[PDB]
Design a protein around this motif. Sequence first.
Motif, PDB file in Angstrom:
ATOM      1  N   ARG A   1      14.013 -30.911  26.924  1.00  0.00           N
ATOM      2  CA  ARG A   1      13.626 -29.503  27.046  1.00  0.00           C
ATOM      3  C   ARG A   1      12.238 -29.323  27.669  1.00  0.00           C
ATOM      4  O   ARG A   1      11.264 -29.928  27.221  1.00  0.00           O
TER       5      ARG A   1
ATOM      6  N   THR B   1       9.668 -26.058  28.722  1.00  0.00           N
ATOM      7  CA  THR B   1       9.519 -24.629  28.428  1.00  0.00           C
ATOM      8  C   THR B   1       8.352 -23.948  29.143  1.00  0.00           C
ATOM      9  O   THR B   1       7.337 -24.575  29.438  1.00  0.00           O
TER      10      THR B   1
ATOM     11  N   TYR C   1      10.952 -19.417  27.341  1.00  0.00           N
ATOM     12  CA  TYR C   1      12.001 -19.671  28.327  1.00  0.00           C
ATOM     13  C   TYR C   1      12.115 -21.168  28.583  1.00  0.00           C
ATOM     14  O   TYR C   1      11.109 -21.843  28.784  1.00  0.00           O
ATOM     15  N   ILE C   2      13.342 -21.676  28.581  1.00  0.00           N
ATOM     16  CA  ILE C   2      13.602 -23.082  28.884  1.00  0.00           C
ATOM     17  C   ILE C   2      13.765 -23.244  30.397  1.00  0.00           C
ATOM     18  O   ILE C   2      14.818 -22.929  30.956  1.00  0.00           O
ATOM     19  N   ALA C   3      12.712 -23.732  31.050  1.00  0.00           N
ATOM     20  CA  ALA C   3      12.701 -23.911  32.506  1.00  0.00           C
ATOM     21  C   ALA C   3      13.641 -25.028  32.964  1.00  0.00           C
ATOM     22  O   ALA C   3      14.152 -24.992  34.082  1.00  0.00           O
ATOM     23  N   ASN C   4      13.853 -26.016  32.102  1.00  0.00           N
ATOM     24  CA  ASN C   4      14.767 -27.119  32.384  1.00  0.00           C
ATOM     25  C   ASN C   4      15.332 -27.655  31.070  1.00  0.00           C
ATOM     26  O   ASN C   4      14.574 -28.057  30.184  1.00  0.00           O
ATOM     27  N   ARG C   5      16.660 -27.652  30.947  1.00  0.00           N
ATOM     28  CA  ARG C   5      17.322 -28.119  29.725  1.00  0.00           C
ATOM     29  C   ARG C   5      17.839 -29.557  29.825  1.00  0.00           C
ATOM     30  O   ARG C   5      18.349 -30.099  28.844  1.00  0.00           O
ATOM     31  N   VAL C   6      17.683 -30.175  30.997  1.00  0.00           N
ATOM     32  CA  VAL C   6      18.154 -31.548  31.232  1.00  0.00           C
ATOM     33  C   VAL C   6      17.043 -32.436  31.804  1.00  0.00           C
ATOM     34  O   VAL C   6      17.297 -33.313  32.632  1.00  0.00           O
TER      35      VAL C   6
ATOM     36  N   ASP D   1      14.160 -35.288  32.288  1.00  0.00           N
ATOM     37  CA  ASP D   1      14.012 -36.712  31.976  1.00  0.00           C
ATOM     38  C   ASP D   1      12.539 -37.043  31.730  1.00  0.00           C
ATOM     39  O   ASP D   1      11.753 -37.179  32.670  1.00  0.00           O
TER      40      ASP D   1
ATOM     41  N   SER E   1      10.597 -25.812  20.611  1.00  0.00           N
ATOM     42  CA  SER E   1      10.133 -26.404  21.867  1.00  0.00           C
ATOM     43  C   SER E   1      10.822 -27.734  22.199  1.00  0.00           C
ATOM     44  O   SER E   1      10.426 -28.417  23.143  1.00  0.00           O
TER      45      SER E   1
ATOM     46  N   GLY F   1      18.255 -29.735  23.947  1.00  0.00           N
ATOM     47  CA  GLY F   1      19.072 -30.306  25.010  1.00  0.00           C
ATOM     48  C   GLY F   1      19.689 -31.630  24.598  1.00  0.00           C
ATOM     49  O   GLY F   1      20.146 -31.780  23.466  1.00  0.00           O
ATOM     50  N   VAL F   2      19.705 -32.588  25.522  1.00  0.00           N
ATOM     51  CA  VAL F   2      20.258 -33.918  25.252  1.00  0.00           C
ATOM     52  C   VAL F   2      19.177 -34.864  24.744  1.00  0.00           C
ATOM     53  O   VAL F   2      17.993 -34.658  25.004  1.00  0.00           O
TER      54      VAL F   2
ATOM     55  N   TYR G   1      24.744 -36.116  23.483  1.00  0.00           N
ATOM     56  CA  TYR G   1      24.910 -34.678  23.690  1.00  0.00           C
ATOM     57  C   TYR G   1      24.891 -33.914  22.360  1.00  0.00           C
ATOM     58  O   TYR G   1      25.131 -34.506  21.306  1.00  0.00           O
ATOM     59  N   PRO G   2      24.597 -32.596  22.405  1.00  0.00           N
ATOM     60  CA  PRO G   2      24.490 -31.763  21.204  1.00  0.00           C
ATOM     61  C   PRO G   2      25.656 -31.885  20.229  1.00  0.00           C
ATOM     62  O   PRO G   2      25.430 -32.035  19.029  1.00  0.00           O
TER      63      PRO G   2
ATOM     64  N   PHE H   1      15.097 -11.704  25.365  1.00  0.00           N
ATOM     65  CA  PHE H   1      15.641 -12.496  26.473  1.00  0.00           C
ATOM     66  C   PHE H   1      16.991 -11.975  26.947  1.00  0.00           C
ATOM     67  O   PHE H   1      17.330 -12.118  28.122  1.00  0.00           O
TER      68      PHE H   1
ATOM     69  N   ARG I   1      18.993 -21.328  27.357  1.00  0.00           N
ATOM     70  CA  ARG I   1      17.745 -20.921  28.006  1.00  0.00           C
ATOM     71  C   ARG I   1      16.664 -20.266  27.130  1.00  0.00           C
ATOM     72  O   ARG I   1      15.505 -20.207  27.539  1.00  0.00           O
TER      73      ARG I   1
ATOM     74  N   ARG J   1      13.917 -19.824  21.315  1.00  0.00           N
ATOM     75  CA  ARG J   1      13.968 -19.327  19.936  1.00  0.00           C
ATOM     76  C   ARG J   1      15.344 -18.748  19.600  1.00  0.00           C
ATOM     77  O   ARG J   1      15.445 -17.702  18.959  1.00  0.00           O
TER      78      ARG J   1
ATOM     79  N   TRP K   1      27.084 -30.131  29.415  1.00  0.00           N
ATOM     80  CA  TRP K   1      25.935 -31.036  29.304  1.00  0.00           C
ATOM     81  C   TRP K   1      26.124 -32.371  30.031  1.00  0.00           C
ATOM     82  O   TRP K   1      25.159 -33.114  30.210  1.00  0.00           O
TER      83      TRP K   1
ATOM     84  N   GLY L   1      14.479 -39.264  36.286  1.00  0.00           N
ATOM     85  CA  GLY L   1      13.119 -39.014  36.751  1.00  0.00           C
ATOM     86  C   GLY L   1      12.859 -37.566  37.122  1.00  0.00           C
ATOM     87  O   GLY L   1      13.527 -36.656  36.627  1.00  0.00           O
TER      88      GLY L   1
END
Lengths: 222, 196, 125, 212, 233, 195, 195, 204, 222
Positions: free
Chosen positions: B19, B21, B25-30, B32, B168, B171-172, B189-190, E146, E187, E190, E219, E227
């Motif tokens: 994750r 943030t 807002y989650i800018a990227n959920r995947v 690395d 905060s 994701g995975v 995965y979740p 949101f 997304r 919270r 997922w 990376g």
Amino acid sequence: QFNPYGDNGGTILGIAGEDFAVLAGDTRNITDYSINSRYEPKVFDCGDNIVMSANGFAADGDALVKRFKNSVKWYHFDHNDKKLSINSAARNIQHLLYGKRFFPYYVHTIIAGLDEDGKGAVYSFDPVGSYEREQCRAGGAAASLIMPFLDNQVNFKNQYEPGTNGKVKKPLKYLSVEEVIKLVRDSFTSATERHIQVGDGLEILIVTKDGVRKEFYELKRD
Amino acid sequence: TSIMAVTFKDGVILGADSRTTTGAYIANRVTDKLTRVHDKIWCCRSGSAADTQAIADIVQYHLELYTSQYGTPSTETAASVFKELCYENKDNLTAGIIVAGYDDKNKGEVYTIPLGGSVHKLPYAIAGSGSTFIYGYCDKNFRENMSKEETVDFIKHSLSQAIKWDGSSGGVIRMVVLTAAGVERLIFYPDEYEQL
Amino acid sequence: GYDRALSIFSPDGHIFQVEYALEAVKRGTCAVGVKGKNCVVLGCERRSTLKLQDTRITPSKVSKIDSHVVLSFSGLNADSRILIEKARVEAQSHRLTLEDPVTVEYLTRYVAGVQQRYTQSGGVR
Amino acid sequence: TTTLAFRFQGGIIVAVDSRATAGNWVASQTVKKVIEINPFLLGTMAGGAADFQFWETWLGSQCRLHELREKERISVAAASKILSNLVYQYKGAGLSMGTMICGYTRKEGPTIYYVDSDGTRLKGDIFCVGSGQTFAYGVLDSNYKWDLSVEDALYLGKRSILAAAHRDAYSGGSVNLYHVTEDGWIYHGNHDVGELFWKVKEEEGSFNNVIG
Amino acid sequence: TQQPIVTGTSVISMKYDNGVIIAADNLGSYGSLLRFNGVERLIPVGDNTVVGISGDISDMQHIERLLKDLVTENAYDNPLADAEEALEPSYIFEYLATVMYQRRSKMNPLWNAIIVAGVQSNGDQFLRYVNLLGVTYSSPTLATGFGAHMANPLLRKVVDRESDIPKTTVQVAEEAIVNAMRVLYYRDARSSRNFSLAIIDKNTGLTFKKNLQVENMKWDFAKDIKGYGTQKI
Amino acid sequence: MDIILGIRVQDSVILASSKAVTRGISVLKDSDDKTRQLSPHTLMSFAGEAGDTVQFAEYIQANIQLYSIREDYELSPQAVSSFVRQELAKSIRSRRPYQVNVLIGGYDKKKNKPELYQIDYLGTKVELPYGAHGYSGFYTFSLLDHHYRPDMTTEEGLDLLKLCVQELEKRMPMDFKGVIVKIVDKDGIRQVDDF
Amino acid sequence: MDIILGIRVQDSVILASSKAVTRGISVLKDSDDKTRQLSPHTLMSFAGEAGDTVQFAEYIQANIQLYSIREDYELSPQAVSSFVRQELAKSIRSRRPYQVNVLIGGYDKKKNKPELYQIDYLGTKVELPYGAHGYSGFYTFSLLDHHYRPDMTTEEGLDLLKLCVQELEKRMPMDFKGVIVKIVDKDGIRQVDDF
Amino acid sequence: SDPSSINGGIVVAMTGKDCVAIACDLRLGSQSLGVSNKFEKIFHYGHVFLGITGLATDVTTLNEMFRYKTNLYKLKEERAIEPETFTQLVSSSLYERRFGPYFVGPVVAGINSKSGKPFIAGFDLIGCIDEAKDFIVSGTASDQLFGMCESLYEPNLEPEDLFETISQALLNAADRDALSGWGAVVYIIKKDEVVKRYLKMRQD
Amino acid sequence: TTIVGVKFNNGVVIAADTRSTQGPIVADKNCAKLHRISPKIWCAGAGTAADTEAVTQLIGSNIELHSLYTSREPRVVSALQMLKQHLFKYQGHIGAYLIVAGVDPTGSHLFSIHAHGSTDVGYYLSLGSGSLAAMAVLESHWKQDLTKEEAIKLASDAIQAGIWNDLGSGSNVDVCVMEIGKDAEYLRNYLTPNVREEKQKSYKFPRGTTAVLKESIVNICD
Ligand SMILES: *[C@@](C)(CO)[C@](*)(O)[C@H](CC(C)C)NC(=O)[C@H](Cc1ccccc1)NC(=O)[C@H](CC(C)C)NC(=O)[C@H](CCc1ccccc1)NC(=O)CN1CCOCC1
Ligand SMILES: *[C@@](C)(CO)[C@](*)(O)[C@H](CC(C)C)NC(=O)[C@H](Cc1ccccc1)NC(=O)[C@H](CC(C)C)NC(=O)[C@H](CCc1ccccc1)NC(=O)CN1CCOCC1
Ligand SMILES: *[C@@](C)(CO)[C@](*)(O)[C@H](CC(C)C)NC(=O)[C@H](Cc1ccccc1)NC(=O)[C@H](CC(C)C)NC(=O)[C@H](CCc1ccccc1)NC(=O)CN1CCOCC1
Ligand SMILES: [Cl-]
Ligand SMILES: [Mg+2]
Ligand SMILES: [Mg+2]
């Protein structure tokens, strides 16, 4: 710290003719960069052939309209159903606004209707109650875009008679309801193009001796 | 972020959520957050994405240049390069990095580098915002010389809880296994880890 | 607060408490006012059952409300002081706001208004 | 704003502009800045529109109540002091006012009182109030004499507002003239600066800085 | 002057041909800490209105008590309390809207965003929003937090204007709501997986669905991402 | 408001007060009388915050005049100054204090002596042979320390006062448009028209 | 520093500059000449921050005098004003800018025309028939708009200038201790001693 | 203390049938005080016209700077610079001062001598190019100008008709702004003739 | 702004709206937010307009020189590395938010860069004020193994979500398709769903309406 005010955007426009008066306003409601509603009316028939709009902070706008509508009701009760004249309404609204001089209604109020001689009337207010009768007034977010256009097209400002060496001005005359609606529609399409808080729809309320008519037109939804 | 690195019998395993943030807002959920600075020296990144990336890029450059002249660098050497950057630029950085690597002589090693730029060699390390919620759990459940399967379960259960309580983190669950055998990437995965 | 309506109407349409207040005036020492062509004169009786009096310090019957207006009275002496005080204060208040001393009619109207207020206020005579 | 009022041989001249501003936005060019309080009393407005429009109107109600109660028209001094005592109660609350209570009475004669929102009250012969007051003063002072005719006094008042309307960015629109005599106030028209400037330039030969 | 402590995130809603749908997750956040997981943020009023609340939970619980008390007060000396003189959605909203604006006017607001969804006595769909500022607005789709940024765009593809409402069934409408809740789980930092959903139909009445979960999530594509630019392993 | 001076001599008290009323970059008036007569033999000059000055002066004036009518008697300068001080001493701890500084010049008819009191907005009273408020003191006090004598006549006091005004006109930054001078003595209060 | 004025007439440029130098509550000097001669037919008056004004004026003066020696030629008023503007335009984005406003009055000998330039501390140059810096303009501009004509003589210009000074002395808050007046024409620069 | 609104002023540019127009007001002030009514904001380097609003000292500085640069351009290239090329030079020059910018709102206008195509462009203070078919606006009454132009403008206007449209756009926008006005100038630009007209407007 | 990037079978596609704002005012109704770094590496930019243009041109310039120096077609990771290190050095003061995409001898690539210098990898990405509206659509309709036509549809739909729902975005949709083995096709104004309706009235003035003081011929020749 808690901030009791907000900005709901939108813009409004009042024009007065010989035997009529129009009060227009877009139907878009916003906060920051979001759209809340594409159709949320903010021009209201308040009875006695008086139309009203209080643009700016919608919560204050609604409260004011609500209170004025109520003021009309009690005017009838206390004075034998007497019709509230547009000039009397204007003065009453000043006291409503100035009553909160030290915690103001964050709104730009415009009312329209007919005066006691049957002629078209438009009054505009600042947030704390100063008012003035005019032939023409734009209020709200896009007021600065629309108003100068109205000066040019309604009151014929900066327009001189061709060939008179800029000595004779273009003569003032009343516009027909058809010509006024044309100016309103063009004013709002232009405002929609160049202002982000303006769009979705346009609602116009026309006031003649016969009553209060409505007209609705689509605006760009981007 | 929630990140951790754990030494075990055959080497070391790095673990992280995915994750990134901007406020809520989650800018990227995947994302690395486990990144390579050398063949068998990796790091877990927490704090500023920009800072940690810029640091890791520089370290990879240094260790590549080290390898060209002096051969394979130690995990301690890698941690020292991270420290040097984090300490000397402490005023302009927000980076919490865990360094983990596998030598054949030294086996699995873990160095944690907090905000100050100090270095701490540990059996295992946890870091990031979500780590606060698993100090109790990790301390009670960590044992030395664990097996690969036991260490994977330990990291999975730990980050599962860190994710559950920290907004905060999520994701995975990414993991990287560092042993003599080589480098293995694991993902969880979740649907699996949430119902643990 | 004491609220009782002391001044009230009677069957025949009289307010006895006001009428009995007039009897107190009738008991009081005589006072006379005569106005000439260019002046006014206020005369006042003083009863002579009181010898061994000190006339230097004894409250005078005629009182100045301002430098240009005077007030004499007949009736309860203690009551008159309250009216005179209120009148003197109002005189200065008028000079302060209007930037002009009171007219005699205005000052009279004020004093009369005070007197009236005590005829339909609760808890007062 | 620019407003002025001066005292002279033939009574009082009162002149104002008609502009209203919200920052650099010109909100209106047609604002009435003179309040007709009664047939013998005028009030000028420079500062917050609402404050002036509300309180000087209220002042007129208080003046009406005075003549009902006292069977006599209120003095200029008493009228001005009602307003000054009112704003003094609100001192610190943030009212913005610089007004001039102008009128004629038998006992006083022609009288002008400057009243502002921090409680100042001043009797005087000449005053200029507003953002362009200094521009008006410049022309007014340099041309003022007590023995000015009614015709010349009206023009000087008009010309002084024009001077300010030209230079001050926050003054303009049109000039509103008033003449106050023993018989009462007389309105002397609305004069648009659009036409008035060029008319004055040509006829007077002034304003050479401007491209003719 | 307040600051919100325990908070609830997005409330989303829309209109369909015969009624209205509304949904909100079961989370009570304490800053970044996802503190409470069994929090119901949809509160029914009678058999014809559902009030969805976001923001401060202590203030939400206060509003619950007010609504509960409103039902009691309406029943007093009212033989038609369960018929003609029952509480309408419009009555319940206007009451809350009055309270919210009064509280902001006393500089002591109820730190909430509220959506009142229901069906009127004449069958008309009711859906209107009100927040801490006393601001009110109505729209075919409404969302808070949101949801306003992410849900509304998706729900507006189904019902973009008034004329699209009769053309939208309850099946299509609920599908769009459930999808929006999944997107918010992806997304919103919270939000929780668990949520509640409520349907108010003019024919079938009030249907309250508890303990729903976000499912059918994507997922798998995460495993391929390595990376942040140049890394290959 | 700015310059107010006071000088007590053998048989009188002389108050000098500037005529200018300035607001922003404009001198609105050059003939302002910054004083009020409290009683026939007592005069108060004032300076400070706009509005507060006149409002306070007239409020005191009304109270002293009310006393005079009630008792048919003139309060002594000492008594008046103590009343004024107490009003200012109340004021300083109010929600909005009077920001007014005053000089009270009076002639005590019982003692046959002139008296000058200086009172600031805090309620700080002092009896003095000569006094000033604001920046005026920074020039005049040192000058009066040198030239002042206790047995001076009214005419000598006026020349001593001219010397002060000249110094202020030379070294003060602002144009205060001269002064109105008033004399308080056994015969009451009168104004010097040519100064 | 405060008041500097400039009027261009038919055959000359007239600069008027206040004589007062004030410091806190003290007028230190009442005979200060706020001007420097840059060349025989070019004069610059100045006003602004203490120290900066003279330092800047003398720096410009030195540069123009250096040019005159090098080329054995006098730079035109237009050329001098453009040089001055550029120096101020550099200054405004420096670590510590010159806070100096100037008027440049000159007589162009090639054109046989008087020229007046107004330049503020930002480097904002304008050629004008009449100019002023600071609060002075708020009184003088409107007055000059009315009374100024382009074909006036030097004597008419001096009377027009007297009218300005009188207005400033009436309505300005501060005492600026009169003005030094200088005339720039075909015959060079000279000072009016009795004003 | 907002650099862009101390002096005041406006510029507007429009396109027509085989022509372009650029116009500006003449006011230079110091906040409320009007100082000069002869301050022109439009300059030209060969056939390429440049209007500049904002802080007056930068207006003057940039004019001198672009005269400097276009003069060297002409000597080395042995030809006059074109509007498209000049637009790029303005952008480069402004962005060079990215973190210490000129407080200006420039506007380029002109006709390409080779292709004959009418061209206009606008910039922000750090050099972002805003190209447009129809019109460009700039200055303290930009909102007003946007409103006037958006309603009054129509494509393919003849030079004589285009003059009326741009003039009315400027005048009525200027009258609703306190810091703009005090006279106006309009440039009508055809392929090989350029007419300059001073407008009569209210002087308050 | 709203900008997106979507990967597909044999390449990558990026898209963008065409609104440029200045506060609440729409400055440009059809500005180009798609930038060419190299022939087959393109960039979508959000944030400070001057910064996105300047940083994209600088790196584009250096990429061209690098390509000539190495006799090789430029790689996306090279542009990515050069951009992020530049942006990082300026600590976010250069407000450029970029979606970098392209094809090279290594394959097809899709990245995003933020102003502070952090980079992200993904199959679908969205940046700008309308990124939440766009990401909602992408999260709803994205799948693995998209075709060319499906990816263009998804990308443009994500931009449309921004156009309609975000006040920061509007007007038209620009697209650039970068497929492996083919030339990159730049589809300027791929969709134009915001055409201005016919005005109610022509505002063409009678010739001579404007009052004129002076005329003069201007000399442009030498
Ligand atoms: C968990 C989430 C917390 O520890 C992890 O540590 C991860 C680490 C991974 C990604 C390597 N951290 C983050 O995701 C990190 C949290 C964070 C935020 C702010 C400062 C430090 C750390 N998030 C970021 O770095 C994001 C990533 C972007 C969206 C790709 N960047 C921001 O939020 C930027 C960074 C600005 C910054 C602040 C302080 C130091 C360095 C950089 N912030 C903003 O853009 C702020 N934004 C302004 C507009 O309004 C919304 C907020
Ligand atoms: C000259 C012309 C200006 O200096 C005069 O002084 C005039 C006097 C005339 C009008 C009697 N003064 C003004 O025009 C005055 C200037 C001013 C404004 C505010 C405070 C003090 C002085 N202008 C106004 O009062 C305007 C009137 C027009 C119709 C808009 N009104 C406002 O500025 C209002 C109310 C101001 C206010 C006072 C106290 C509390 C709250 C508000 N404010 C707005 O309209 C705000 N603005 C409108 C545009 O939308 C953004 C917000
Ligand atoms: C969406 C539409 C919203 O962000 C997109 O992200 C687009 C990106 C496209 C255009 C590349 N963003 C904008 O349009 C962007 C929004 C913005 C505004 C201000 C700061 C950051 C972002 N708008 C701009 O960049 C405009 C473009 C104009 C039309 C050339 N520029 C401005 O608004 C400039 C900002 C310059 C700036 C300076 C310092 C730091 C950051 C930005 N502002 C002005 O021109 C304002 N002012 C006008 C009067 O003269 C002085 C300057
Ligand atoms: Cl990252
Ligand atoms: Mg949009
Ligand atoms: Mg003006």
